[PDB]
Design a binder for this molecule. Structure first.
Ligand SMILES: [K+]
Ligand SMILES: [Mg+2]
Ligand SMILES: [Mg+2]
Ligand SMILES: [Mg+2]
Ligand SMILES: [Mg+2]
Ligand SMILES: [Mg+2]
Ligand SMILES: [Mg+2]
Ligand SMILES: [Mg+2]
Ligand SMILES: [Mg+2]
Ligand SMILES: [Mg+2]
Ligand SMILES: [Mg+2]
Ligand SMILES: [Mg+2]
Ligand SMILES: [Mg+2]
Ligand SMILES: [Mg+2]
Ligand SMILES: [Mg+2]
Ligand SMILES: [Mg+2]
Ligand SMILES: [Mg+2]
Ligand SMILES: [Mg+2]
Ligand SMILES: [Mg+2]
Ligand SMILES: [Mg+2]
Ligand SMILES: [Mg+2]
Lengths: 222, 51, 155, 185, 148, 53
RNA sequence: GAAAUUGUUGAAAGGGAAGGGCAUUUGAUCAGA
RNA sequence: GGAAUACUGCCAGCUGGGACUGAGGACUGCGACGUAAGUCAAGGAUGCUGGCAUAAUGGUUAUAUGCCGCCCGUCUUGAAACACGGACCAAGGAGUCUAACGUCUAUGCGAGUGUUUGGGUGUAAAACCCAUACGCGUAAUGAAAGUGAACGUAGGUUGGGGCCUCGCAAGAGGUGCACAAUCGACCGAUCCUGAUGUCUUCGGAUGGAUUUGAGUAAGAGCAUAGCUGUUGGGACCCGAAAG
RNA sequence: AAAUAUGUAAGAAGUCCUUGUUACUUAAUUGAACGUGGACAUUUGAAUGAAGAGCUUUUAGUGGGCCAUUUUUGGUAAGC
């Protein structure tokens, strides 16, 4: 006649089972990432040995950071930044690369710095500044239960499942990315590396496609 | 009441991601790649050094 | 009435504190602080005195002796952040300091403290005497001279 | 700075409490606030919302309207719920026996219901009998039959009842109302 | 009361809610219905079409008592019977001893036929009747007796 | 597209389980191996300025 | 028996106005515990 | 040929120094370590120690110092302006009341509503009570004579909250008030059609229409009060030259 | 004959199938429109977003503007 101990034990057991599932899935993710990376490296080496060139697949994911303030923005780029949820300077989002979104990045190029995020960048972004949109509220991702309660219907049970769905642009990338609240990054800790931010990265500025240097920039801003 | 950052606070790092213990124990962040000895083709090298 | 007293009053029940998760773990003092090390006192009435480090006490203070016979600094506590640990060491093997603790210094001069000073100083000076000019070094006060740059000086 | 996509500090635009200072209405609101919070009954939620409505948003419901609602198939034994006033209607001669729960009953409406053999109950009695709104039929009076409504949207070719104090010949019927005088509407 | 008006709130605000550019001047558009045809034409034609001009024929010394003729629809036709007698007249819907309703005494001039009455004979005395009102009364088994 | 989607759904429900009925935007290109057999890269340089007028 | 304005006394400052904001020094003064 | 190193990137590698913060206030959660007891850096600071115990901290004030700081009000695209008013101070000083109204809201009653013209009464301008009328509403439409609102479960369709039935649930079905769109039906006007009958010129049945109404289609109104808005009034306050 | 700008569409109010009404239409159940009945929910049919969507009433002020980049007219030009 206590109805407490046999329920706390059941809850601890269910928690242990969910943790074992997360552990197995994260080990599988580590194996997946390692295999894919080594396979790309070996493909490049094999093409070079065969006298060919391995043209890597075009990047499926970009990270976009709004580097311009909110004043004096023309209406079409303003609407595109709103639709990408970059409504504040140093707010960043993940974008799945298609023609439909590349034509958006083209329109907002002078106001954003974007590139191809690495696994390390995504991991640190989600771990430090990962917030979920739950009931229209910004809730920090401090526990895997939050992620399971809001994304479990898509098979995403943990923060590493979320990161996997982000880095590999999975079937539920749209849902996971939208669940992620736009990342509120700081200014870069070592500065922007250039005297003037608002020319293209190619022209010695900060905006546009900086494809792999987005990782350095975002790690400084994170 | 207070957001504790993983990538610090190892306790929170382990609360999320139970695999972090295995990762650290097996040093998967410093994994040695298997040595391979494929050589680039002569056409690749000639094209690379071509003026 | 002058104020029309409030309908409800704040409760005069001081709530209990919630359980603090701060355990007291032992201090990790810097590696330059090894018993027998000559320390330079940076503050207090004995600021500038070079003393000998001894047992590390439970309240994180450092037990030091001048020795009193050498420079007039008795057996006393100092804060580890107010000393400069030189690279000059005497051997404390032979000094018995198990007696000195916090309650030893917890609040004219006690004859017991005078006697303990003599006992510790005897072995300390015996050890000091086998290093030339160490006694005079410990007698002299430390002071920064013109041009001294502590960020480059080695102690 | 933030580029806001919506107005900041925008009130919901819905009443969260009755404007009325009626203590009994506030007691009914407290009861149904508890019920709507702790029952998950859509009936309780809609009754709570209806308890906030202004007078024009609670048009009276006649006993003839109630009787037509009971003539609905399968609804003859349901308790009729009107969050507002139930008025009498002599144009109907056969009122059925039924339970009606309402904020207010006109003397004539209560007389007709009791005479037909039913009962008139308050909303708290309704809550005790049917805490989850079981077997209820919520009726609402005609909102857009108000006299004020027919003047809304006045304009050319709208047919919307000019705001006028005296009516008849010589009162806004000549130029702009017939082709023989300038034009029509 | 004055303490609830917005003029208390405008104290300290120079223009009193009337604007700095366009002030509260005396009669900027004219007085009353001025300019209904010239500079208030839009507000007249919208919201008051038909305002200007003449629309019919005059009637010198018109007396409204001549046209007094309040209308009662068949839908009620029974509120004129006292409530207690109404039940015993509705029951026993007899051709003999049918209730007599003096609608003129009740204050009506013409009986119209909007609603429908029960199948109970009623002797309806009226100055005027609608055609459909009379047919509905007869179908219920009553009669219309013209009075003056 | 509606006609083809009806046909594809019918064939899917007669064969197995896969639909993919929504259109998709142009996707990023997959990896490919470019051969140099008969296609050794030819080196170009920017041309000097001249007038040809 | 207010203010403007004024006398005396006391205190203080004062190289072509004065007044103000943030911060602290100095002088004076003062509540709380 | 075998290495190294640079460069770039990764580590859920280790670790030192510095600064700001310590919100919360029984427990509850997720975890870590431990076989387990339990412990922990795990849903927000504790432990130890010293001095002082008052002008010491702090407040106020004056001054000094660093940096900053144009004169308000007003009209204006634009005022510190070489635009206007203002030497100073006190007191006074400008959206009011009324008639009739729009929206909204509160209240009473509700197909009705309004006691207060007046009568009765009174502890006497109060309060309390009341007949007949009258106003508005319950019928519209037509210039008018005039006519005057159910084919039907007061209609069909689409949606529709809520309710009902089944279902663990998802959902499925039924019923669907308000409300929205749409097609109909009814009343009046207009234009046609023109039965029986006949004061043979009256009557106007029946059936229609790219026509029309501020209509009907199980009434919502009336009264009081409040803000806001409208019109006439001195009409927010002050101001002509004039008549 | 561009670039920019611009209309429409991207579904369940959909696609298809059987057959009822008419005074319209056809040589003609020919068709037209509206119906009755029937099959088709994981991606219900591109992307991204959505402090939600829809709806109504009522009122304030305003109805002198000016400036910058770019397009551009008059003018030699102008802080025109
Ligand atoms: K004006
Ligand atoms: Mg720096
Ligand atoms: Mg710069
Ligand atoms: Mg917080
Ligand atoms: Mg802000
Ligand atoms: Mg203002
Ligand atoms: Mg003014
Ligand atoms: Mg006096
Ligand atoms: Mg004075
Ligand atoms: Mg390196
Ligand atoms: Mg605290
Ligand atoms: Mg101080
Ligand atoms: Mg200055
Ligand atoms: Mg100014
Ligand atoms: Mg000037
Ligand atoms: Mg002037
Ligand atoms: Mg002057
Ligand atoms: Mg005054
Ligand atoms: Mg005058
Ligand atoms: Mg004159
Ligand atoms: Mg103007």
């Amino acid at each position: 006649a206590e109805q407490v101990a046999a329920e706390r034990a059941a809850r601890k057991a269910a928690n242990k089972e969910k943790r074992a599932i997360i552990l197995e899935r994260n080990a599988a993710y580590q194996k997946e990432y390692e295999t894919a990376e080594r396979n790309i490296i070996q493909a490049k080496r094999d093409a070079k040995a065969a006298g060919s060139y391995y043209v890597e697949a075009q990047h499926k994911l970009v990270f976009v950071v709004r580097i311009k303030g909110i004043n004096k923005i023309p209406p079409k780029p303003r609407k595109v930044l709103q639709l990408l949820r970059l409504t504040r300077i140093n707010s960043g989002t993940f974008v799945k690369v298609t023609k439909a979104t590349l034509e958006l990045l083209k329109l907002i190029e002078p106001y954003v710095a974007y590139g191809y995020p690495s696994y390390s960048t995504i991991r640190q972004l989600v771990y430090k500044r990962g917030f979920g949109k739950i009931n229209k509220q910004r809730v920090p991702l401090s526990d895997n239960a939050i992620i399971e309660a809001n994304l479990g219907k898509y098979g995403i049970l943990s923060i590493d499942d979320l990161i996997h769905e982000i880095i590999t642009v999975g079937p539920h990338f749209k849902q996971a990315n939208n669940f992620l609240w736009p990342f509120k990054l700081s200014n870069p800790s070592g500065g922007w590396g250039v005297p003037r931010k608002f020319k293209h990265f190619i022209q010695g500025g900060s905006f546009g496609n900086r494809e792999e240097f987005i990782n350095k920039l975002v790690k400084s801003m994170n | 009441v207070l957001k504790k950052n993983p990538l610090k606070n190892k306790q929170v790092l382990l609360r999320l991601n139970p695999y972090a213990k295995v990762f650290a124990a097996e040093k998967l962040g410093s994994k040695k790649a298997e040595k391979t000895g494929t050589k680039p083709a002569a056409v690749f090298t000639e094209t690379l050094k071509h003026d | 009435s002058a104020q029309k007293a409030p309908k409800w009053y704040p409760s005069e029940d001081v709530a209990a504190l919630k359980k603090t998760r701060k355990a007291a773990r032992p201090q990790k003092l810097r590696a330059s602080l090894v018993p027998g090390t000559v320390l330079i006192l940076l503050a207090g009435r004995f600021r500038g005195k070079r003393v000998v480090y001894l047992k590390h006490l439970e309240d994180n203070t450092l037990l030091i002796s001048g020795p009193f016979k050498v420079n007039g600094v008795p057996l006393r506590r100092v804060n580890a952040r107010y000393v400069i640990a030189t690279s000059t060491k005497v051997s404390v093997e032979g000094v018995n300091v198990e007696k000195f603790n916090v309650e030893y210094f917890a609040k004219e001069i006690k004859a017991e403290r005078v006697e303990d000073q003599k006992v510790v100083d005897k072995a300390l000076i015996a050890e000091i005497k086998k290093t030339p000019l160490l006694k005079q070094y410990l007698s002299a006060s430390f002071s920064l001279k013109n041009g001294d740059k502590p960020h480059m000086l080695k102690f | 700075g933030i580029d806001h996509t919506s107005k900041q500090h925008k009130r919901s635009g819905h009443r969260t409490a009755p404007k009325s200072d009626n203590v009994y209405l506030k007691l009914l609101v407290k009861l149904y606030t508890f019920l709507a919070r702790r029952t998950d009954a859509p009936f309780n939620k809609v009754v709570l919302k209806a308890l906030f409505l202004s007078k024009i948003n609670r048009p009276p419901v006649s006993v003839s309207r109630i009787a037509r609602a009971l003539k609905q198939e399968g609804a003859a034994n349901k308790t009729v719920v009107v969050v507002g006033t139930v008025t009498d209607d002599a144009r109907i001669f056969e009122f059925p026996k039924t339970t009606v729960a309402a904020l207010r009953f006109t003397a004539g409406a209560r007389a007709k219901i009791v005479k037909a053999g039913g009962e008139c109950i308050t909303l708290d009695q309704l809550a005790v009998r049917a805490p989850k709104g079981q077997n209820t039929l919520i009726l609402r009076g005609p909102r857009n039959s108000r006299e004020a409504v027919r003047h809304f949207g006045m304009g050319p070719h709208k047919g919307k009842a000019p705001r006028i104090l005296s009516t008849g010949r010589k009162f806004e019927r000549a130029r702009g109302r017939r082709r023989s005088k300038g034009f029509k509407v | 009361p004055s303490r609830f008006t917005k003029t208390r709130k405008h104290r300290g605000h120079v223009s009193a809610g009337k604007g700095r550019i366009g002030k509260h001047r005396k009669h900027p558009g004219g007085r009353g219905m001025a300019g209904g045809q010239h500079h208030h034409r839009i507000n007249m034609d919208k919201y008051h079409p038909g305002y200007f001009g003449k629309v019919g024929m005059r009637y010198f010394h018109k007396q409204q008592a001549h046209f007094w003729k309040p209308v009662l629809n068949l839908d009620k036709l029974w509120t004129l019977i006292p409530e207690d007698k109404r039940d015993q007249y509705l029951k026993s819907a007899s051709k003999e001893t049918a209730p007599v309703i003096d609608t003129l005494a009740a204050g009506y001039g013409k009986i119209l036929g909007k609603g429908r009455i029960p199948n109970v004979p009623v002797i309806v005395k009226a100055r005027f009747v609608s055609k459909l009102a009379e047919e509905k009364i007869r179908a219920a088994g009553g009669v219309v007796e013209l009075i003056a | 597209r509606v006609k083809a989607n009806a046909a594809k759904r019918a064939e899917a429900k007669a064969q197995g389980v896969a639909v993919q009925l929504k259109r998709q935007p142009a996707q990023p290109r997959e990896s490919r191996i470019v051969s140099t057999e008969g296609n050794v890269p030819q080196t170009l340089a920017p041309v000097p300025y001249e007038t040809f007028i």
